[PDB]
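Lab notebook, bench 4. We co-purified these components, and the gel suggests they stay together. Before we commit to crystallization screens, I want a quick structural picture of the whole thing.
Request: model the full complex, all chains together.
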Amino acid sequence: VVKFMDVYQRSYCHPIETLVDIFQEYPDEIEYIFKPSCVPLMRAGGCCNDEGLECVPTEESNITMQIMRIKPHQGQHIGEMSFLQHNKAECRPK
Amino acid sequence: VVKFMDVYQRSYCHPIETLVDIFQEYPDEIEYIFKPSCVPLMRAGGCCNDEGLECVPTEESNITMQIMRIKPHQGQHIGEMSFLQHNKAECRPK
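Here is the predicted assembly.
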């Protein structure tokens, strides 16, 4: 059984590795097929224990990954894509 | 720049630490109060890069944690709660 102090600390609002579907970040590119179709990004997660607060990113930056992009019957290429990352996260008023 | 192959394998379907709101896990106990309000759980995540496959849990099990809970009109007592975890996850034919 996990100790309360662990549960409490771990579950607390922090940037956590999150698998994000590429379409969420590049919705204009829906007719394309991405390989892989999701990228691992550090995003604000966890809960606050103050009700009136909510976990929100406070320091952002972009990261670049090589992604295969495919257009059915027209082309394919492996190129770089920028994704939004959360370098810092903290609880704040709603 | 993260290399194509590293991104590809880092996001392919597998159990990944996921912050799960406790209210969600226990639809009944909504009047209850929990702290922390969410727990860190291993859950299937990521993508299959194949239209015929979906990412699903394949070997589950419960994990127990100490949660300071407050059943309305009672005290604020630590308690052991069981949460569903995903030990193994793989792409399986949709």
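The domain at 1-94 of chain B is CATH 2.10.90.10 (Cystine Knot Cytokines, subunit B). Worth comparing against the SEC data before the next meeting. Residues 18 and 41 of chain B are 5 Å apart (CA to CA).
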